Amino acid sequence: NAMWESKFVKEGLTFDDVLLVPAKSDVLPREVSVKTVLSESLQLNIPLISAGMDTVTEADMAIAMARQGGLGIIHKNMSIEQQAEQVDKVKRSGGLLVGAAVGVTADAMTRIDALVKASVDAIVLDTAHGHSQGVIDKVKEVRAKYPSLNIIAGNVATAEATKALIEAGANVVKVGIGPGSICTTRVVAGVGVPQLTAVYDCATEARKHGIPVIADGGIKYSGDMVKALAAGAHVVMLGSMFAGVAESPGETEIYQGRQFKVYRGMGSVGAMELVPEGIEGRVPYKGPLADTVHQLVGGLRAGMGYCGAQDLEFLRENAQFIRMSGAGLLESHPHHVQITKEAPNYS
Amino acid sequence: NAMWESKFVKEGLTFDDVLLVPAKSDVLPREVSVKTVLSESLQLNIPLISAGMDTVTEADMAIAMARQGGLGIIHKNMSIEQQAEQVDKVKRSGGLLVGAAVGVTADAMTRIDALVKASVDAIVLDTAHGHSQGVIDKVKEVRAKYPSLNIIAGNVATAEATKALIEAGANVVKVGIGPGSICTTRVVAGVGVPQLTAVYDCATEARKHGIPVIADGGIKYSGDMVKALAAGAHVVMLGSMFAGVAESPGETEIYQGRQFKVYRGMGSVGAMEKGSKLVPEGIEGRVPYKGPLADTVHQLVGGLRAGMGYCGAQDLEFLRENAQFIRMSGAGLLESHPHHVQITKEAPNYS
Amino acid sequence: SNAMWESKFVKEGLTFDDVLLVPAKSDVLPREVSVKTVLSESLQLNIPLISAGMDTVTEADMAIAMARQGGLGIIHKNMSIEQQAEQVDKVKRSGGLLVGAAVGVTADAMTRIDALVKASVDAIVLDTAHGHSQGVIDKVKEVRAKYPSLNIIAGNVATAEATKALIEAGANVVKVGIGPGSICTTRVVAGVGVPQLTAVYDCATEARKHGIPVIADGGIKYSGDMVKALAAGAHVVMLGSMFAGVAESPGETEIYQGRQFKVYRGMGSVGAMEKKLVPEGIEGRVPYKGPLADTVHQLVGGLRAGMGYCGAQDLEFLRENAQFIRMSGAGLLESHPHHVQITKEAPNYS
Amino acid sequence: AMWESKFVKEGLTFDDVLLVPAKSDVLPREVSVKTVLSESLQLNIPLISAGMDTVTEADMAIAMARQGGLGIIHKNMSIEQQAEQVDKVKRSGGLLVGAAVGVTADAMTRIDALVKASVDAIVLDTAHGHSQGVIDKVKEVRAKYPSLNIIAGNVATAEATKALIEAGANVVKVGIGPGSICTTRVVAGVGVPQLTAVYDCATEARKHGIPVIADGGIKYSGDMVKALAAGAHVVMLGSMFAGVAESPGETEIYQGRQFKVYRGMGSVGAMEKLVPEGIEGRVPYKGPLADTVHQLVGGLRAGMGYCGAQDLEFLRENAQFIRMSGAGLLESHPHHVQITKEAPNYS
Ligand SMILES: O=C(Cn1c(-c2ccccn2)nc2ccccc21)Nc1ccc2ccccc2c1
Ligand SMILES: O=C(Cn1c(-c2ccccn2)nc2ccccc21)Nc1ccc2ccccc2c1
Ligand SMILES: O=C(Cn1c(-c2ccccn2)nc2ccccc21)Nc1ccc2ccccc2c1
Ligand SMILES: O=C(Cn1c(-c2ccccn2)nc2ccccc21)Nc1ccc2ccccc2c1
Ligand SMILES: O=c1[nH]cnc2c1ncn2[C@@H]1O[C@H](COP(=O)(O)O)[C@@H](O)[C@H]1O
Ligand SMILES: O=c1[nH]cnc2c1ncn2[C@@H]1O[C@H](COP(=O)(O)O)[C@@H](O)[C@H]1O
Ligand SMILES: O=c1[nH]cnc2c1ncn2[C@@H]1O[C@H](COP(=O)(O)O)[C@@H](O)[C@H]1O
Ligand SMILES: O=c1[nH]cnc2c1ncn2[C@@H]1O[C@H](COP(=O)(O)O)[C@@H](O)[C@H]1O
């Protein structure tokens, strides 16, 4: 009867619920450092990872991300031979960093072998429910065979789940159940945790083991990314904000005179070909990845400057939030003004 | 006196106010059990019941519901003779389960007499106010004559009301005051309780007596059903999500080049006129055509299996006794649904 | 002391769309409950409804219709003293019906009140923007002194302190509402107000201690709001917009895009003020709703259903026993129809 | 302790609250609307026009001063041009006029010219008032011009207000992100809900006898009253002054309605004249300033009359708020009635 009475006690927050409180600062946005260390064999210049989705990251995107100082995860919706080849294609081009997504299946180990042979830097054990026993066991099975391999496991949204994956052998934990722009998990199954609260809860546990977390999904604007990092995440994972980029898979298509690209959930009907937990759609074309990355990092620099963070470590450990209502949100966006042109970082 | 200061102390949540929290899980959605026991003689393989509304459930729907593992409540907007024929029709169709709705009226027993002869499996004593004395007196009057008959009573939204119905003879209690898609009770009378809190409060009381509660109304997506079952409900009742299937009463009509089917509240002007001083408490409308019932049901159950899998629930009871929620704001809701992307294809379980 | 500084943001407010009335044990059917109500021995109404004292809401034709329905009408003050006195006499001679008249806080207040009393008016409505103003208190005291037996209704107020002040001044009815008006912009232009349900509840709390009835004025857009207002401690509610489009309300029916509408505007709007201070209301139009009888039946019927759910035999049980439950915006969306295409229009919804 | 305090703070904005009516023996006609920001800076009306290139130049500053207010000459022009603007307002009857200065190396050079032009106040105008550079720049100016009115901003915290007062500023400007044209809270994720920001800053500034300026996010006259009631001596407006005839730029016609350009100083357009923290848009033409001012001051007199405030100091010390939900706000505006004509003080 303790489980019965504790059903509705927990409370969760997401990005649009909060703002970062300005702090004393003697650092300029130009001066701040945005480097992150996921592991001793995996370091990034910028805290950005492109999602391992069929409409987001393949060879070209992974190469582009690695060159902006980020990281790309090759999706698993292709043959083992195809993924190992694309991973190699990224490694061919200057010894850039590259990751590959692997699902929890029978052929999982076989796929990982061809990936490790292709000198992949990290594998992403992707599953909808990262707190499942099957996922945990497969992490252990993989950890045993490759102790020197970077293992990124997810997705989870609780501290209990984070501890479970870390103990299984995961050195990076991916956080996010339902916040995705193309996701319908919370709608069709009713399951999830508000992403900021999820990140905070998991980071609270991950810190105790010196393990980094990845904030994955739900990021609409560059400010959301700053919030995610300040909530405990080392690095974020983006899907929709990279999907309209030239380097992302798919072809540019015209709808009502504008340029779009296909963006679909990996749990959508189209991506599968279980009940679907994703949606299919399109996002505006945005040209080269460099322009989008520049606005994102530039937003992050401004944010860190406001908070007085010389590095992301200070940001995670010192940044304070303040909660706001819907009226606060509307004030936070432009209001009572007819916007006449698009800014490079707004709509 | 002390009632004056307590006017605004109570707080209520609904489906869009919360989310289910993922937990340890050794079970796959493929392997979960979705069966339920409502009574000694009533067992459903899926937790679904189609509403007893004149635009939702008749003989054809009740057959299709039963063949899916669910239950259909034949509506009362027809003669006593007609309703008995349809109950009999569902029964002759291979031993399928079938329910039937009865209103709190003078000739209620007469309707119930003909329903029992036709071997109806359950009777729904449906009122707008389940905590009315007339309904309570009716349940006793029916339990006395038919000690073996499955009686479902409603609608209620408070623990005290559930206690009254259970002690009166009801062996199943139906929860829901105002959450209906077609319902204006809360708007025109100002009375109601947010459904998820209602389900939770009623399930709390009914649990003490070993009595199942039905979550009736307010469910628009499959996730809302999983939340309702996790809140303490044994089964759920759907009107809106069933009103568009092929087996539902009424014919298809065209809007925007696509097909729609009529759906209206039983307290709407149209429904009251067919059934017959009271002011209406529902609206008349239409919902998208969705084809055969099997497709809708498969989506519904599929969402439940996934959600139960997330919670690590091997069966519905574990989910009822262990599932934890987390409260969220409007921003949380906005994030929960798809966002900032233009959808190009309707998903089988989304819009 | 730093008290006033530290208590600035302490209070919280609730409106109709923030709450629901909780269903309770009921030994009564909607057709059996009594909706009658007493404001004073000389002023008893069969239905808890008063039509607002506005130039686009209540004149003689409206006051007569309201009274015949068992309600009350307040003749507005945007006319000469002689005219308003005539309007009262007309209603009073139309079968001996109850009729009220609005009076403002001006120098000629006493003159106008003398005429209305001479015309045998039943209630005087001392109407001002700020009921807790010193000018209002004094005017109430003057009138109570000259007319010890005259019904005095004073407002508007939104706090208990204000309510206590008008009661001690000599008012036997207190009207509540600062800003909730559909037509109002006071909260937008002055930044001043109190969420109407909390307002009614705070003022009723004070007024209960004195046996003074309270009127819930403005903010009511559906019949359920009226039930909530009455359950929050009000004896009677006052309506503007829901009565604005009936046939008996002032103003001819105008045609806008085929559909027939009726002008409804704030008493503090630019147009009304003409018939130094900036506007605190807007000018607009509402759909023509036909005879008052059809609107009243929907409202009363909503109340009967409401009282039925709460197990209230009369309005006194409602005020004393009815409990609310607070809900989020998600709760409100569930409360209204949703995820359906409305094909026809219910007599009591839009 | 720093990690666990991240989400404890709550913030309020204008649309979250209402002013509670109090006992009153004062009529709106009789109230005192004056304000003293310093010994050498007194306003007959609590209004300041924003230092933006689409809000305030010489013509706006003149009109504002003659109404009893103040105009701030923006800095998107040469040192010589700005000194001429200040002089222009000065030879128009000896009117009060302020000028905007940013934190650059040549800031002193510009200030030297503005002082020579007999300016009444210089506004040290930056995105992050709690920056060390801003604090240092305040010290330099105070050390050279001990009698010069220095407005320093912008800030949103008591700690930042304290630091600016300590640095030598004699007026503090409050607001991080509430601006109608502002995207700072969206792109950088940083900010504090304005009404709480004013209150938190006034609480500190009260101790030093320093007045604060509530800058940004005011869309109706009632918002201004709330801002003042929350502790502000005076408010600064942008969008409500940008469609005024005396503002820079000219009138454009779109579908019969007249408009005027309004953009943030952080927008691409203004910067061109880092990533942007504003947008470019347009507001409706409102005609001569006197009409907008009349409505604003009249709403304030209404509010003060409701609160029983004879003067603005009474309002600051005594006015009480009540919190409300989105249903409260919805009720607070006109509702369920189709508006047939524009009121002078509403949309
Ligand atoms: O300067 C701008 C953006 N910006 C603006 C502007 C104007 C009004 C409100 C907000 N920002 N105007 C600009 C003009 C040119 C370049 C950048 C500009 N933003 C920031 C962000 C973080 C900072 C941290 C320490 C010190 C200074 C910082 C500045
Ligand atoms: O696999 C999917 C849906 N799905 C997805 C997907 C991936 C990420 C986020 C959401 N959905 N991709 C799929 C590809 C094929 C079939 C089903 C798929 N959903 C679930 C739901 C509950 C589970 C419980 C235990 C173990 C696994 C569970 C899986
Ligand atoms: O009388 C109006 C506005 N107004 C109205 C009106 C009517 C109903 C609700 C709100 N305002 N009607 C008016 C008619 C003419 C001039 C002003 C008017 N506003 C105020 C505001 C504050 C006051 C403080 C002390 C004393 C009187 C005060 C009056
Ligand atoms: O029965 C209806 C309205 N109504 C409905 C209906 C159906 C489902 C949900 C809500 N209302 N169906 C009707 C059919 C005919 C006449 C009235 C009807 N309303 C009420 C309202 C309050 C009551 C209090 C005590 C006892 C009975 C009460 C009944
Ligand atoms: O179809 C799906 N269903 C649910 N979540 C998904 C699906 N596809 C991708 N995701 C998650 O959502 C993230 C994308 O988030 P975005 O930044 O909102 O696009 C991915 O990195 C995955 O974690
Ligand atoms: O007209 C009515 N007024 C109020 N409630 C109704 C009315 N008609 C049906 N209902 C209830 O609302 C449920 C429909 O829920 P839905 O799934 O949201 O459409 C029904 O099963 C009834 O419990
Ligand atoms: O112009 C005005 N400004 C503010 N309130 C007004 C004005 N005119 C009428 N009111 C109030 O608003 C009520 C109308 O409420 P309604 O039912 O929402 O239309 C009236 O009875 C008055 O109490
Ligand atoms: O580009 C910008 N980014 C952020 N804030 C700005 C920008 N431009 C002006 N502001 C601020 O916003 C205020 C205008 O507020 P408004 O009254 O809401 O339009 C100005 O006085 C500045 O303090």
TrEMBL record, chain A:
Binding site for IMP 2: S181, C183, D216, G218, G239, S240
EC number(s) from the headed UniProt entry: 1.1.1.205
Biological or metabolic pathway of the protein: Purine metabolism; XMP biosynthesis via de novo pathway; XMP from IMP: step 1/1
Cofactor: K(+)
Binding site for IMP: S181, D216, G217, G218, G239, S240, Y263, R264, G265, M266, G267, E277
Entry binding sites for XMP: S181, C183, D216, G218, G239, S240, Y263, M266
SMART domains: CBS (SM00116), IMPDH (SM01240)
GO molecular function: IMP dehydrogenase activity; metal ion binding; nucleotide binding
Reaction equations catalysed: IMP + NAD(+) + H2O = XMP + NADH + H(+)
Record keywords, A-Z: CBS domain, GMP biosynthesis, Metal-binding, NAD, Oxidoreductase, Potassium, Purine biosynthesis, Repeat
Primary enzyme class: oxidoreductase
Regulation: Mycophenolic acid (MPA) is a non-competitive inhibitor that prevents formation of the closed enzyme conformation by binding to the same site as the amobile flap. In contrast, mizoribine monophosphate (MZP) is a competitive inhibitor that induces the closed conformation. MPA is a potent inhibitor of mammalian IMPDHs but a poor inhibitor of the bacterial enzymes. MZP is a more potent inhibitor of bacterial IMPDH.
Domain of life assignment: Bacteria
Binding site for IMP 1: N155, S181, D216, G218, G239, S240, Y263, M266, G267, E277
Residues at the active site: C183 (thioimidate intermediate)
BP-aspect Gene Ontology terms: GMP biosynthetic process; GTP biosynthetic process
Quaternary structure (record): Homotetramer.
UniProt record similarity statement: Belongs to the IMPDH/GMPR family.
Job description of the protein: Catalyzes the conversion of inosine 5'-phosphate (IMP) to xanthosine 5'-phosphate (XMP), the first committed and rate-limiting step in the de novo synthesis of guanine nucleotides, and therefore plays an important role in the regulation of cell growth.
Protein name in the entry: Inosine-5'-monophosphate dehydrogenase
Species of origin: Bacillus anthracis (anthrax bacterium)
Organism classification: Bacteria, Bacillati, Bacillota, Bacilli, Bacillales
Automatic annotation (TrEMBL), chain B:
Reaction(s) catalysed by this chain's protein: IMP + NAD(+) + H2O = XMP + NADH + H(+)
Pathway linked to the protein: Purine metabolism; XMP biosynthesis via de novo pathway; XMP from IMP: step 1/1
Required cofactor(s): K(+)
Top-rank taxon, per record: Bacteria
Residues involved in XMP binding: S181, C183, D216, G218, G239, S240, Y263, M266
Binding site for IMP 2: S181, C183, D216, G218, G239, S240
Key words of the record: CBS domain, GMP biosynthesis, Metal-binding, NAD, Oxidoreductase, Potassium, Purine biosynthesis, Repeat
SMART domains, A to Z: CBS, IMPDH
Pfam families assigned: CBS (PF00571), IMPDH (PF00478)
Residues reported to bind NAD(+): D126, T127, A128, G176, I177, G178
Activity regulation comment: Mycophenolic acid (MPA) is a non-competitive inhibitor that prevents formation of the closed enzyme conformation by binding to the same site as the amobile flap. In contrast, mizoribine monophosphate (MZP) is a competitive inhibitor that induces the closed conformation. MPA is a potent inhibitor of mammalian IMPDHs but a poor inhibitor of the bacterial enzymes. MZP is a more potent inhibitor of bacterial IMPDH.
Residues that, per the record, bind IMP: S181, D216, G217, G218, G239, S240, Y263, R264, G265, M266, G267, E281
One of the record's GO molecular function terms: IMP dehydrogenase activity
Active site: C183 (thioimidate intermediate)
SUPFAM superfamilies membership: CBS-domain pair (SSF54631), Inosine monophosphate dehydrogenase (IMPDH) (SSF51412)
GO terms under biological process: GMP biosynthetic process; GTP biosynthetic process
Binding site for K(+): G178, G180, C183, E335, S336, H337
Positions of IMP 1 binding: N155, S181, D216, G218, G239, S240, Y263, M266, G267, E281
InterPro entries in the cross-refs: Aldolase_TIM (IPR013785), CBS_dom (IPR000644), CBS_dom_sf (IPR046342), IMP_DH (IPR005990), IMP_DH/GMP_Rdtase_CS (IPR015875), IMP_DH_GMPRt (IPR001093)
Enzyme class: oxidoreductase
UniProt EC number: 1.1.1.205
Protein's job: Catalyzes the conversion of inosine 5'-phosphate (IMP) to xanthosine 5'-phosphate (XMP), the first committed and rate-limiting step in the de novo synthesis of guanine nucleotides, and therefore plays an important role in the regulation of cell growth.
Family recorded in the similarity comment: Belongs to the IMPDH/GMPR family.
Self-association state and partner proteins as the record states: Homotetramer.
HAMAP family: IMPDH
Name of the protein in its database record: Inosine-5'-monophosphate dehydrogenase
UniProt source species: Bacillus anthracis
